[PDB]
Amino acid sequence: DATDDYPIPNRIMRTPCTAEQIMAAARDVEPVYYERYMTDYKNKPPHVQQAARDRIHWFFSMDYAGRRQYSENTATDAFFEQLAWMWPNWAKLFFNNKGVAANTTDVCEQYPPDDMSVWNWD
């Protein structure tokens, strides 16, 4: 039920980067996407914020096989991901579209892996 790029962009399933690398890249090369995401994030309660960080860290901790199985799970069942009951767009910056995915993954490796400052906005 998944395609190569939907629901999760191919480049995102293949990248060696952390979430924080992709976010730092977005801040520079996809700033509108970054700012839309952080605006959404900052409006969520702390428990939801924490859950999104934990879940995206889990996602990028997997290899391609794990990421692809997640994509398949969410392609076959739109309600697979429990976080979506609280925040459907918890991973919008990462998974929304392949153009953003290509731009961010083209440069994410140039950024530091663990820079948590990307989670602080205003």
Ligand X SMILES: OC[C@H]1O[C@@](CO)(O[C@H]2O[C@H](CO)[C@@H](O)[C@H](O)[C@H]2O)[C@@H](O)[C@@H]1O
Distance from CA of residue 5 to its chain's centroid? 14
> Which residues of the chain form contacts with ligand X (CB under 6 A)?
7, 74, 78, 81, 84, 88-92, 95-96
Q: Compare residues 41 and 90 and give the one whose CB is closer to ligand X.
A: 90
Minimal distance, residue 8 CB to ligand X, in Å: 6
Minimal distance, residue 11 CB to ligand X, in Å: 13
Q: Compare residues 41 and 95 and give the one whose CB is closer to ligand X.
A: 95
Q: Compare residues 29 and 84 and give the one whose CB is closer to ligand X.
A: 84
Minimal distance, residue 66 CB to ligand X, in Å: 14
Q: Compare residues 89 and 113 and give the one whose CB is closer to ligand X.
A: 89
Minimal distance, residue 3 CB to ligand X, in Å: 11
In whole angstroms, what is the distance from residue 41 CA to residue 55 CA?
14
Residue type, 20: E
Distance from CA of residue 57 to its chain's centroid? 9
The answer to whether the CB of 86 falls within 8 A of the CB of 48 is yes
Q: How far, CA to CA in Å, does 118 sit from each of 34, 71, 73, 80, 93?
A: 9, 25, 28, 27, 12
